[PDB]
């Protein structure tokens, strides 16, 4: 989740 | 019935208008949001966006909800295009379980001030100072034993 | 604000009012009044004159071609329009085919004694003819020089967007205008559908009958006055619209609106005409007068327009209550 | 070097000077001088004659149509141009709409007594009309045969590239020329912007007023001489430009330039005219003369041009100092 | 505001002009370098170059600096296209750390003639003859020991 959710949720 | 032409930076896509009228909340499906992208000299909409990413955005309108991702476009680029086309948070969350990254689980609270102080104090050792101090002593009790 | 405005997004600059033509020219009123009518409108800065080939069986154009021939005005200063659709009892003399557009316009330029009209209008949609034949026929008469621009009239908003997508596909000319009905009791089309098209493709609006053919003039309360429009023959559809109780439900709304015109130092026509020009999406308003005193008091409905503030608009809406769903 | 050159990249071959027309024809000078003016220019190899429909309220064309009718020259040997934009006080008689281009050119071919002009110019840009209507109207009058080519005048460099991208999109004809002002004190546009367009799309330049309407002729130092251009009526904008001290700051630069013309065996007009033709990017220079002796001494400004070497150019630049940022 | 058309050997790309005016040093961003590629009969620029490589060069102008590489085009072909379009040595160095190959580290020097002779003589055994002779004896001293 250091590359995935860093630009996923927004 | 009639069709629309969408021009993603030189690449032409043509769907019927009623396909975009399945999802009348997004950018392409709302007739007052896309009116600033129209091109009256060519009778089409011109977006200066990513070329290979719109092939997956178009399939979301045709299939009725399935969000895929091509191999070429990365995660940080395909995620912006969902944000730009305003596909919605239900469409954005389908990019999670398609990719495999599961959503975060919401933890329940004991709806007080005493028990809400002590729940986050031991279960979540990264919260406060002695929360990190309760973890450094919780490793000793098992290790001596 | 502005007296001369563009017809849509074209280059044509029309006055915001234009003396139209119906039952009056060649029919009801005499031709001595009509020359006196047109000189009173031309001298007050109105250049847009409108007619059609069906009006008084093609006699409203002959009496308009004699006026411009006699008065000696420059053709480069006026804007003459003309509608096409009904031009005879024959089967092949009514429609928007390639045969009738070329022959109906060529005969109207013999009645009007001109060499070209400025706008030529399709009077109503035709379901028989395909859209490609009407756009190819209207681009032909433009390229011959029989017209300068072309517009639609009583079309839908979906049919104009279909006649625009043919013109861009086959490299022809799209329409520039649209004549839709718009007064205080008919405001559905021009207030929610046509301003969508102006922001997209740039067609304008040019509204007609702003007094509902004399009903909003306020003369139709105590009954049918003599020498009025409802008292004529063939206008029973008008007379039995006001004599019906829905018209009496409309006369009960012109009593409260009667008082506001005296509050603003005007009369009920000048409130009714200047209410239509309160937007920017309407490029012209086509009046119709029966004598000189009606036209003079209608031309002076420009001074009423700066008084039409948002307070007085929003209470008129509270009287009528027919504001469309934005 | 060459006397006849191509107008841009077109096929039209014009002489490098062309006797224009302004206040002189039909206004200031008499028509006896004008026939004597044009025969003195036609016999020296100048074919390009220029006019417009606004010059002396449309009397500069009638006096030019009588000369070609009387002298009996072949129409296939001359190049007549004409500008369009101002053609009446009416609202619909000024602009670059489809209505005015077709009617303003049709009336000018009745004044000039011709059947076609060779180039028709848009006199200035129009912000009201869209660019598609002007390109479609100029391609219509070409395809009717009322003109052969068309050009722009006082347009920007971004507007010409926009009227070129419409012509290639809709399969129409692009412009071939551009009339921009260019003399010794106004050299910003023709020296850094227009040679970009010639290498890209192939439009030429055809400069006008190369003596700044008589200022660079050197007659405006001691004051206002009689029978000069500044002494006329309506030309107070010119007279109060030279009488202003920025013009006296310009007369203090025509003293040093006065001496170099005597060093090269010429006078100050012939230095000023041949300085404009020193490039290849300018296809013609439109003179303006008031009598025969002015035109004869201006026509002979071709022999000065081989003396205009790089040494004498670079010191003139050191006098003026207004060389644009390349 | 207006747009340009770029024709990479039959494939049409259309971006706005101001996107190319972000980087006014490169080939597409400098209005005197690309003027010899113009085509006045079609109002476009024609390059007879690699087709699938320009989809990545266009994204560098839109994203503002990110240099990717498609799977199809190799390293020796995508590197020439950066050299042809003149994207710059900062753009060329971004092809290093994207690909993973790190830059070479510059070694410091003792700014003399004596110490600069002996620094490259033992630390860099591939320099000279006895530099290779000092390595063949430096393996023995540890191996006997
Ligand atoms: N596109 C189409 O298919 C279509 C269809 C119909 C009409 N039109 C156009 O619409 C234009 C307008 O025609 P219209 O007559 O319906 O417009 P209108 O202005 O609504 O009609 C007003 C009528 O009431 C009377 N009137 C005018 N001013 C008055 C005033 N101050 N006080 C009292 N009465 C007054 C006049 O004669 P009276 O007093 O005798 O009543 C006039 O006939 C026509 O010329 C035609 O070109 C187009
Ligand atoms: N595209 C546009 O919008 C536009 C606008 C304006 C003009 N133009 C064109 O420009 C053309 C040139 O007109 P222009 O008069 O401004 O050019 P110009 O050559 O700069 O004007 C020279 C003026 O000075 C005088 N003169 C000429 N030769 C002289 C000489 N050797 N010695 C002393 N005086 C001399 C003449 O009359 P005086 O002695 O009485 O002064 C003449 O009027 C016009 O014909 C017109 O077609 C185009």
Residue numbers in the entry:
A (entry chain B): 494 to 503
B (entry chain B), E (entry chain D): 103 to 247
C (entry chain A), D (entry chain C): 36 to 361
From the paper:
Voltage-gated potassium channels (KV) play vital roles in electrically excitable and non-excitable cells. KV1.3 was the first ion channel discovered in immune cells three decades ago2 and exhibited only C-type inactivation. In these two structures, the VSD is in a depolarized conformation and the inner gate is open.
The hKV1.3–KVβ2.1 complex assembled as a tetramer with a four-fold symmetry. The α-carbon of R4 is at the level of F306, and R1, R2 and R3 are close to the extracellular surface of the channel, consistent with the VSD being in a depolarized conformation. EM densities corresponding to putative K+ ions were observed at ion-binding sites 1, 3, and 4 but not site 2. However, it is also possible that an indication of flexibility, which means that Y447 and D449 can adopt various rotameric conformations, suggesting that critical hydrogen bonds related to C-type inactivation between Y447–T441 and D449–W43614 may be weakened or broken. These observations suggest that the KV1.3 structure may be related to a C-type inactivated conformation. A dominant intra-subunit W436–D449 interaction was observed in hKV1.3, together with a secondary H451–D449 inter-subunit interaction.
